[PDB]
Symmetry: D2
Subunit: 116 residues, 4 copies
Amino acid sequence: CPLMVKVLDAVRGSPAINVAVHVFRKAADDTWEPFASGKTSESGELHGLTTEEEFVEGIYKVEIDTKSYWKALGISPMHEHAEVVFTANDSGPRRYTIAAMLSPYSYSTTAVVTNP
Amino acid sequence: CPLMVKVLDAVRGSPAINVAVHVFRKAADDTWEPFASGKTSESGELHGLTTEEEFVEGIYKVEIDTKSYWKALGISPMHEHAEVVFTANDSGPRRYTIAAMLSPYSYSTTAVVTN
Amino acid sequence: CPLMVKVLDAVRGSPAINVAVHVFRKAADDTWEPFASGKTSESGELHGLTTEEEFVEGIYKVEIDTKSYWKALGISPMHEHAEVVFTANDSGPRRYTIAAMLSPYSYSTTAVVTNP
Amino acid sequence: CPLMVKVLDAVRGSPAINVAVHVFRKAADDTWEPFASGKTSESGELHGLTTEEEFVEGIYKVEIDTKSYWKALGISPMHEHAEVVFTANDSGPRRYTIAAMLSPYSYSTTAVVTN
Ligand SMILES: [Zn+2]
Ligand SMILES: [Zn+2]
Ligand SMILES: [Zn+2]
Ligand SMILES: [Zn+2]
Ligand SMILES: [Zn+2]
Ligand SMILES: [Zn+2]
Ligand SMILES: [Zn+2]
Ligand SMILES: [Zn+2]
Ligand SMILES: [Zn+2]
Ligand SMILES: [Zn+2]
Ligand SMILES: [Zn+2]
Ligand SMILES: [Zn+2]
Protein backbone atom coordinates (compact mmCIF):
# COMPACT_ATOMS: atom_id res chain seq x y z
CA CYS A 1 0.00 0.00 0.00
CA PRO A 2 1.07 3.54 -0.93
CA LEU A 3 -0.96 4.68 2.25
CA MET A 4 -1.84 2.55 5.37
CA VAL A 5 -3.45 3.84 8.72
CA LYS A 6 -2.95 1.95 12.08
CA VAL A 7 -4.92 2.89 15.31
CA LEU A 8 -4.23 1.66 18.98
CA ASP A 9 -6.49 2.13 22.17
CA ALA A 10 -3.99 3.50 24.84
CA VAL A 11 -6.65 3.12 27.63
CA ARG A 12 -7.34 -0.63 27.30
CA GLY A 13 -4.02 -1.74 25.68
CA SER A 14 -5.69 -3.21 22.48
CA PRO A 15 -5.95 -2.55 18.69
CA ALA A 16 -8.92 -0.12 18.05
CA ILE A 17 -11.21 -2.42 15.91
CA ASN A 18 -14.22 -1.45 13.53
CA VAL A 19 -13.33 2.32 13.75
CA ALA A 20 -14.35 4.66 10.80
CA VAL A 21 -11.55 6.61 8.97
CA HIS A 22 -11.85 9.42 6.34
CA VAL A 23 -9.03 10.69 4.02
CA PHE A 24 -9.19 14.21 2.18
CA ARG A 25 -6.83 16.05 -0.29
CA LYS A 26 -6.59 19.91 -0.36
CA ALA A 27 -7.99 21.30 -3.66
CA ALA A 28 -7.36 24.49 -5.70
CA ASP A 29 -10.12 26.60 -4.00
CA ASP A 30 -8.84 25.50 -0.54
CA THR A 31 -11.62 23.04 0.34
CA TRP A 32 -10.98 19.45 1.52
CA GLU A 33 -11.98 17.09 -1.31
CA PRO A 34 -13.02 13.49 -0.33
CA PHE A 35 -10.27 10.96 -1.29
CA ALA A 36 -10.87 7.47 0.37
CA SER A 37 -12.60 5.94 3.49
CA GLY A 38 -13.17 2.62 5.42
CA LYS A 39 -13.18 0.87 8.89
CA THR A 40 -10.17 -0.67 10.76
CA SER A 41 -9.49 -4.50 10.85
CA GLU A 42 -9.00 -6.92 13.80
CA SER A 43 -5.35 -5.72 14.03
CA GLY A 44 -6.36 -1.98 14.06
CA GLU A 45 -5.10 -1.53 10.42
CA LEU A 46 -6.85 -0.19 7.19
CA HIS A 47 -5.22 -1.41 4.02
CA GLY A 48 -6.11 -0.91 0.33
CA LEU A 49 -7.01 2.89 0.49
CA THR A 50 -5.48 4.07 -2.83
CA THR A 51 -3.38 3.15 -5.96
CA GLU A 52 0.17 4.32 -6.84
CA GLU A 53 -1.16 6.60 -9.65
CA GLU A 54 -4.12 7.98 -7.68
CA PHE A 55 -1.81 9.08 -4.84
CA VAL A 56 -0.58 12.30 -6.51
CA GLU A 57 1.57 15.05 -4.88
CA GLY A 58 -0.43 17.40 -2.57
CA ILE A 59 -1.53 17.95 1.13
CA TYR A 60 -3.70 15.26 2.84
CA LYS A 61 -5.82 15.09 6.08
CA VAL A 62 -6.64 11.83 8.00
CA GLU A 63 -9.75 11.90 10.32
CA ILE A 64 -10.33 8.97 12.81
CA ASP A 65 -13.86 8.85 14.32
CA THR A 66 -13.77 8.97 18.20
CA LYS A 67 -17.09 10.42 19.31
CA SER A 68 -18.56 7.22 20.85
CA TYR A 69 -15.56 4.89 21.05
CA TRP A 70 -15.22 5.62 24.76
CA LYS A 71 -18.96 5.75 25.61
CA ALA A 72 -18.76 2.49 27.63
CA LEU A 73 -16.13 4.14 29.83
CA GLY A 74 -18.37 6.97 30.84
CA ILE A 75 -16.24 9.78 29.30
CA SER A 76 -16.85 12.27 26.48
CA PRO A 77 -13.53 13.07 24.54
CA MET A 78 -11.81 16.42 23.61
CA HIS A 79 -13.30 16.32 19.95
CA GLU A 80 -15.43 14.06 17.72
CA HIS A 81 -12.34 13.09 15.58
CA ALA A 82 -8.58 12.57 16.05
CA GLU A 83 -6.89 14.23 13.01
CA VAL A 84 -3.48 14.50 11.30
CA VAL A 85 -2.26 16.58 8.31
CA PHE A 86 0.77 15.70 6.12
CA THR A 87 2.45 17.03 2.87
CA ALA A 88 3.24 14.25 0.26
CA ASN A 89 5.62 13.61 -2.71
CA ASP A 90 7.11 17.04 -3.18
CA SER A 91 10.05 14.64 -3.87
CA GLY A 92 9.19 11.27 -5.56
CA PRO A 93 7.92 7.69 -5.09
CA ARG A 94 7.29 7.15 -1.34
CA ARG A 95 5.02 4.94 0.84
CA TYR A 96 3.41 6.29 4.10
CA THR A 97 2.15 4.56 7.30
CA ILE A 98 0.25 6.96 9.70
CA ALA A 99 0.28 5.45 13.27
CA ALA A 100 -1.99 6.87 16.09
CA MET A 101 -2.04 6.03 19.84
CA LEU A 102 -5.43 7.45 21.20
CA SER A 103 -6.85 8.48 24.65
CA PRO A 104 -9.99 10.79 25.28
CA TYR A 105 -7.83 13.99 26.10
CA SER A 106 -4.40 13.10 24.45
CA TYR A 107 -2.89 11.41 21.35
CA SER A 108 0.57 10.71 19.81
CA THR A 109 0.96 10.31 16.05
CA THR A 110 3.92 9.46 13.86
CA ALA A 111 4.43 9.44 9.99
CA VAL A 112 6.80 6.60 8.79
CA VAL A 113 7.93 7.40 5.15
CA THR A 114 9.93 4.89 3.08
CA ASN A 115 11.46 4.93 -0.40
CA PRO A 116 10.87 1.59 -2.25
CA CYS B 1 -6.65 32.86 30.81
CA PRO B 2 -9.62 31.14 29.17
CA LEU B 3 -7.16 29.68 26.57
CA MET B 4 -3.33 29.14 26.97
CA VAL B 5 -0.91 27.24 24.56
CA LYS B 6 2.45 25.75 25.59
CA VAL B 7 5.02 24.26 23.07
CA LEU B 8 8.13 21.95 23.88
CA ASP B 9 11.05 20.97 21.57
CA ALA B 10 11.39 17.11 22.05
CA VAL B 11 14.71 16.89 19.99
CA ARG B 12 16.86 19.45 22.03
CA GLY B 13 15.01 19.15 25.42
CA SER B 14 13.97 22.85 25.78
CA PRO B 15 10.99 25.30 25.45
CA ALA B 16 10.12 26.26 21.82
CA ILE B 17 10.87 29.97 21.94
CA ASN B 18 9.39 32.65 19.72
CA VAL B 19 7.28 30.39 17.48
CA ALA B 20 4.09 31.77 15.75
CA VAL B 21 0.62 30.38 16.82
CA HIS B 22 -2.66 31.09 14.90
CA VAL B 23 -6.12 30.09 16.27
CA PHE B 24 -9.34 29.69 14.13
CA ARG B 25 -13.10 28.97 14.71
CA LYS B 26 -15.31 26.89 12.31
CA ALA B 27 -17.74 29.50 10.61
CA ALA B 28 -21.25 29.40 9.15
CA ASP B 29 -19.97 28.40 5.64
CA ASP B 30 -17.72 25.57 7.02
CA THR B 31 -14.50 27.47 6.51
CA TRP B 32 -11.91 28.37 9.21
CA GLU B 33 -12.31 32.04 10.49
CA PRO B 34 -9.23 33.84 12.08
CA PHE B 35 -9.83 34.08 15.89
CA ALA B 36 -6.58 35.08 17.72
CA SER B 37 -2.71 35.02 17.23
CA GLY B 38 0.67 35.59 19.10
CA LYS B 39 4.21 34.23 19.60
CA THR B 40 5.49 31.97 22.41
CA SER B 41 7.62 33.42 25.34
CA GLU B 42 11.02 32.46 26.86
CA SER B 43 9.13 29.64 28.77
CA GLY B 44 7.41 28.31 25.58
CA GLU B 45 4.01 29.70 26.82
CA LEU B 46 1.42 32.00 25.05
CA HIS B 47 -1.00 33.93 27.35
CA GLY B 48 -3.60 36.75 26.63
CA LEU B 49 -5.13 35.16 23.46
CA THR B 50 -8.90 35.83 24.17
CA THR B 51 -11.54 36.89 26.72
CA GLU B 52 -14.15 35.06 28.60
CA GLU B 53 -16.80 36.90 26.45
CA GLU B 54 -15.37 36.33 22.97
CA PHE B 55 -14.72 32.57 23.69
CA VAL B 56 -18.24 31.07 23.05
CA GLU B 57 -19.10 27.29 22.49
CA GLY B 58 -17.90 25.95 19.03
CA ILE B 59 -15.05 24.03 17.24
CA TYR B 60 -11.51 25.57 17.34
CA LYS B 61 -8.13 24.76 15.52
CA VAL B 62 -4.66 25.71 16.98
CA GLU B 63 -1.97 25.96 14.22
CA ILE B 64 1.80 26.03 15.35
CA ASP B 65 4.27 27.13 12.70
CA THR B 66 7.02 24.58 12.05
CA LYS B 67 8.29 25.37 8.47
CA SER B 68 11.83 26.48 9.44
CA TYR B 69 12.13 25.49 13.12
CA TRP B 70 14.16 22.39 12.16
CA LYS B 71 16.38 23.82 9.36
CA ALA B 72 19.60 24.02 11.51
CA LEU B 73 19.11 20.34 12.09
CA GLY B 74 19.12 19.70 8.39
CA ILE B 75 15.74 17.94 8.35
CA SER B 76 12.46 19.11 6.73
CA PRO B 77 9.35 17.94 8.72
CA MET B 78 6.23 15.90 7.77
CA HIS B 79 4.19 19.18 7.30
CA GLU B 80 4.61 23.03 7.53
CA HIS B 81 2.33 23.17 10.65
CA ALA B 82 1.42 21.15 13.76
CA GLU B 83 -2.45 21.27 14.14
CA VAL B 84 -4.77 20.35 17.18
CA VAL B 85 -8.65 20.54 16.86
CA PHE B 86 -10.94 20.64 20.02
CA THR B 87 -14.68 21.15 20.75
CA ALA B 88 -15.63 23.64 23.48
CA ASN B 89 -18.95 21.94 24.81
CA ASP B 90 -21.45 22.80 27.68
CA SER B 91 -22.75 24.84 29.86
CA GLY B 92 -20.62 26.52 31.10
CA PRO B 93 -17.23 28.28 30.53
CA ARG B 94 -14.11 26.18 31.24
CA ARG B 95 -10.45 27.21 31.05
CA TYR B 96 -8.32 25.26 28.40
CA THR B 97 -4.51 24.62 28.25
CA ILE B 98 -3.32 22.91 24.99
CA ALA B 99 0.23 21.32 25.47
CA ALA B 100 2.21 20.10 22.49
CA MET B 101 5.59 18.11 22.52
CA LEU B 102 7.02 18.34 18.97
CA SER B 103 9.50 16.27 16.74
CA PRO B 104 9.83 16.51 12.90
CA TYR B 105 7.86 13.20 12.13
CA SER B 106 5.85 12.82 15.38
CA TYR B 107 3.86 14.86 17.98
CA SER B 108 1.98 14.27 21.31
CA THR B 109 -0.71 16.70 22.43
CA THR B 110 -2.85 16.91 25.51
CA ALA B 111 -5.87 19.18 26.45
CA VAL B 112 -6.28 20.06 30.17
CA VAL B 113 -9.84 21.43 30.97
CA THR B 114 -10.54 22.94 34.43
CA ASN B 115 -13.84 24.00 36.27
CA CYS C 1 13.95 24.11 41.90
CA PRO C 2 17.00 22.17 40.58
CA LEU C 3 14.41 19.23 39.92
CA MET C 4 10.54 19.50 39.45
CA VAL C 5 8.08 16.73 38.33
CA LYS C 6 4.72 17.40 36.64
CA VAL C 7 2.03 14.68 36.01
CA LEU C 8 -1.15 14.96 33.70
CA ASP C 9 -4.16 12.40 33.48
CA ALA C 10 -4.58 11.87 29.62
CA VAL C 11 -7.87 9.93 30.16
CA ARG C 12 -9.86 12.66 31.99
CA GLY C 13 -8.01 15.80 30.68
CA SER C 14 -6.93 17.03 34.27
CA PRO C 15 -3.79 17.50 36.46
CA ALA C 16 -3.10 14.18 38.33
CA ILE C 17 -3.54 15.44 42.02
CA ASN C 18 -2.38 13.70 45.37
CA VAL C 19 -0.19 11.15 43.49
CA ALA C 20 2.93 9.65 45.32
CA VAL C 21 6.41 10.16 43.56
CA HIS C 22 9.78 8.50 44.50
CA VAL C 23 13.25 9.62 43.27
CA PHE C 24 16.49 7.26 43.44
CA ARG C 25 20.22 7.85 42.58
CA LYS C 26 22.52 5.11 41.23
CA ALA C 27 25.08 3.89 43.77
CA ALA C 28 28.51 2.29 43.44
CA ASP C 29 27.28 -1.26 44.06
CA ASP C 30 24.66 -0.65 41.36
CA THR C 31 21.69 -0.43 43.73
CA TRP C 32 19.18 2.41 43.63
CA GLU C 33 19.53 4.54 46.74
CA PRO C 34 16.56 6.66 47.97
CA PHE C 35 17.02 10.39 47.23
CA ALA C 36 13.70 12.29 47.77
CA SER C 37 9.83 11.72 47.76
CA GLY C 38 6.40 13.48 48.04
CA LYS C 39 2.83 13.85 46.59
CA THR C 40 1.67 16.13 43.64
CA SER C 41 -0.24 19.47 44.19
CA GLU C 42 -3.64 20.74 42.81
CA SER C 43 -1.67 21.74 39.57
CA GLY C 44 -0.12 18.18 39.21
CA GLU C 45 3.34 19.57 40.22
CA LEU C 46 5.88 18.52 42.98
CA HIS C 47 8.26 21.29 44.03
CA GLY C 48 10.99 21.37 46.76
CA LEU C 49 12.56 17.93 46.10
CA THR C 50 16.26 18.84 46.52
CA THR C 51 18.99 21.60 46.80
CA GLU C 52 21.58 22.74 44.22
CA GLU C 53 24.18 21.35 46.61
CA GLU C 54 22.55 17.90 47.10
CA PHE C 55 21.83 17.40 43.39
CA VAL C 56 25.21 15.99 42.39
CA GLU C 57 26.31 14.45 39.11
CA GLY C 58 24.99 10.85 38.54
CA ILE C 59 22.12 8.70 37.11
CA TYR C 60 18.56 9.21 38.56
CA LYS C 61 15.23 7.26 38.36
CA VAL C 62 11.74 8.88 38.85
CA GLU C 63 8.85 6.46 39.86
CA ILE C 64 5.18 7.66 39.72
CA ASP C 65 2.64 5.51 41.64
CA THR C 66 -0.26 4.37 39.31
CA LYS C 67 -1.59 1.04 40.67
CA SER C 68 -5.03 2.26 41.77
CA TYR C 69 -5.23 5.75 40.23
CA TRP C 70 -7.63 4.32 37.62
CA LYS C 71 -9.50 1.89 39.92
CA ALA C 72 -12.69 4.06 39.65
CA LEU C 73 -12.46 3.52 35.92
CA GLY C 74 -12.60 -0.26 36.09
CA ILE C 75 -9.13 -0.87 34.58
CA SER C 76 -5.90 -2.48 35.92
CA PRO C 77 -2.82 -0.66 34.26
CA MET C 78 0.30 -2.18 32.50
CA HIS C 79 2.50 -1.80 35.73
CA GLU C 80 2.26 -0.49 39.40
CA HIS C 81 4.49 2.54 38.41
CA ALA C 82 5.25 4.84 35.42
CA GLU C 83 9.15 5.19 35.52
CA VAL C 84 11.80 7.39 33.77
CA VAL C 85 15.62 7.24 33.92
CA PHE C 86 17.96 10.19 33.18
CA THR C 87 21.73 11.08 33.30
CA ALA C 88 22.41 14.44 35.14
CA ASN C 89 24.47 17.73 35.14
CA ASP C 90 27.46 17.03 32.94
CA SER C 91 28.95 20.59 32.78
CA GLY C 92 27.96 23.44 35.09
CA PRO C 93 24.59 23.69 36.79
CA ARG C 94 21.45 22.67 34.94
CA ARG C 95 17.80 22.66 36.11
CA TYR C 96 15.45 19.75 35.09
CA THR C 97 11.62 19.46 34.66
CA ILE C 98 10.43 15.86 34.02
CA ALA C 99 6.87 16.03 32.41
CA ALA C 100 4.62 12.89 32.10
CA MET C 101 1.27 12.37 30.23
CA LEU C 102 -0.26 9.14 31.62
CA SER C 103 -2.86 6.49 30.50
CA PRO C 104 -3.24 2.77 31.80
CA TYR C 105 -1.36 1.15 28.73
CA SER C 106 0.65 4.18 27.33
CA TYR C 107 2.70 7.18 28.31
CA SER C 108 4.73 10.15 26.95
CA THR C 109 7.62 11.63 28.95
CA THR C 110 9.90 14.56 28.15
CA ALA C 111 13.03 16.03 29.99
CA VAL C 112 13.34 19.88 29.65
CA VAL C 113 16.95 20.91 30.58
CA THR C 114 17.75 24.64 31.08
CA ASN C 115 20.99 26.61 31.81
CA PRO C 116 20.31 29.15 34.73
CA CYS D 1 5.44 -14.59 19.52
CA PRO D 2 4.77 -14.36 23.25
CA LEU D 3 6.82 -11.07 23.33
CA MET D 4 7.58 -8.73 20.33
CA VAL D 5 9.41 -5.28 20.45
CA LYS D 6 9.00 -2.57 17.76
CA VAL D 7 11.14 0.74 17.60
CA LEU D 8 10.46 3.95 15.48
CA ASP D 9 12.70 7.01 14.93
CA ALA D 10 10.46 10.10 15.44
CA VAL D 11 13.15 12.51 14.19
CA ARG D 12 13.76 11.10 10.64
CA GLY D 13 10.33 9.34 10.18
CA SER D 14 11.60 5.74 9.67
CA PRO D 15 11.99 2.35 11.46
CA ALA D 16 15.01 2.17 13.88
CA ILE D 17 17.16 -0.51 12.19
CA ASN D 18 19.77 -2.86 13.63
CA VAL D 19 19.40 -1.37 17.20
CA ALA D 20 20.32 -3.57 20.31
CA VAL D 21 17.50 -4.64 22.79
CA HIS D 22 18.12 -6.38 26.15
CA VAL D 23 15.27 -7.83 28.28
CA PHE D 24 15.53 -8.59 32.08
CA ARG D 25 13.32 -10.17 34.86
CA LYS D 26 13.20 -8.98 38.58
CA ALA D 27 14.92 -11.81 40.62
CA ALA D 28 14.77 -13.23 44.16
CA ASP D 29 17.41 -10.76 45.49
CA ASP D 30 15.65 -7.74 43.80
CA THR D 31 18.27 -7.34 41.09
CA TRP D 32 17.64 -7.46 37.28
CA GLU D 33 18.47 -10.98 35.85
CA PRO D 34 19.30 -11.20 32.05
CA PHE D 35 16.30 -12.85 30.23
CA ALA D 36 16.64 -12.44 26.37
CA SER D 37 18.34 -10.19 23.70
CA GLY D 38 18.50 -9.42 19.89
CA LYS D 39 18.74 -6.66 17.22
CA THR D 40 15.89 -4.98 15.33
CA SER D 41 15.22 -5.88 11.61
CA GLU D 42 14.75 -3.63 8.53
CA SER D 43 11.11 -3.09 9.60
CA GLY D 44 12.17 -1.95 13.15
CA GLU D 45 10.74 -5.27 14.66
CA LEU D 46 12.38 -7.96 17.00
CA HIS D 47 10.63 -11.44 16.92
CA GLY D 48 11.73 -14.87 18.47
CA LEU D 49 12.84 -13.52 21.91
CA THR D 50 11.26 -16.24 24.17
CA THR D 51 8.90 -19.23 24.44
CA GLU D 52 5.56 -19.77 25.96
CA GLU D 53 7.20 -22.09 28.62
CA GLU D 54 10.02 -19.69 29.64
CA PHE D 55 7.74 -16.53 29.87
CA VAL D 56 6.18 -17.00 33.41
CA GLU D 57 4.20 -14.34 35.48
CA GLY D 58 6.60 -11.62 36.90
CA ILE D 59 8.06 -8.07 36.39
CA TYR D 60 10.08 -7.44 33.16
CA LYS D 61 12.30 -4.41 31.87
CA VAL D 62 12.92 -3.76 28.11
CA GLU D 63 16.12 -1.77 27.50
CA ILE D 64 16.78 -0.06 24.03
CA ASP D 65 20.37 1.09 23.32
CA THR D 66 20.44 4.77 22.25
CA LYS D 67 23.96 6.06 23.12
CA SER D 68 25.30 6.59 19.58
CA TYR D 69 22.02 6.41 17.59
CA TRP D 70 21.75 10.28 17.06
CA LYS D 71 25.52 11.09 16.97
CA ALA D 72 25.22 12.00 13.26
CA LEU D 73 22.59 14.49 14.25
CA GLY D 74 25.00 16.25 16.55
CA ILE D 75 23.00 15.72 19.80
CA SER D 76 23.59 13.69 22.95
CA PRO D 77 20.33 12.27 24.43
CA MET D 78 18.74 12.50 27.97
CA HIS D 79 20.18 8.97 28.80
CA GLU D 80 22.18 6.10 27.16
CA HIS D 81 19.01 3.80 27.09
CA ALA D 82 15.22 4.03 26.61
CA GLU D 83 13.52 1.76 29.22
CA VAL D 84 9.95 0.29 29.61
CA VAL D 85 8.83 -1.74 32.74
CA PHE D 86 5.62 -3.96 32.66
CA THR D 87 3.94 -6.60 34.94
CA ALA D 88 3.03 -9.98 33.35
CA ASN D 89 1.14 -12.06 32.65
CA ASP D 90 -0.61 -10.98 35.76
CA SER D 91 -2.96 -12.94 33.72
CA GLY D 92 -1.94 -15.53 32.25
CA PRO D 93 -0.87 -16.35 29.33
CA ARG D 94 -1.25 -13.36 26.98
CA ARG D 95 0.81 -12.20 23.99
CA TYR D 96 2.59 -8.75 24.43
CA THR D 97 3.83 -6.20 21.80
CA ILE D 98 5.88 -3.20 23.26
CA ALA D 99 5.99 -0.25 20.79
CA ALA D 100 8.27 2.73 21.33
CA MET D 101 8.37 6.08 19.23
CA LEU D 102 11.84 7.63 20.16
CA SER D 103 13.40 11.29 20.19
CA PRO D 104 16.60 12.40 22.13
CA TYR D 105 14.68 14.22 25.03
CA SER D 106 11.31 12.43 24.81
CA TYR D 107 9.55 9.10 24.15
CA SER D 108 6.10 7.53 23.87
CA THR D 109 5.50 3.82 24.61
CA THR D 110 2.44 1.58 24.42
CA ALA D 111 1.90 -2.20 25.60
CA VAL D 112 -0.73 -4.01 23.39
CA VAL D 113 -1.94 -7.25 25.22
CA THR D 114 -4.03 -9.90 23.43
CA ASN D 115 -5.71 -13.29 24.41
ZN1 LIG E 1 -1.15 -2.83 3.06
ZN1 LIG F 1 -16.76 9.57 10.41
ZN1 LIG G 1 -12.85 17.27 13.43
ZN1 LIG H 1 -2.30 32.88 31.46
ZN1 LIG I 1 0.28 29.72 11.08
ZN1 LIG J 1 -1.28 22.85 7.87
ZN1 LIG K 1 9.70 24.87 41.86
ZN1 LIG L 1 5.34 4.17 45.63
ZN1 LIG M 1 8.15 -0.35 38.88
ZN1 LIG N 1 24.03 -3.27 24.34
ZN1 LIG O 1 6.61 -12.51 15.88
ZN1 LIG P 1 19.61 2.96 31.60
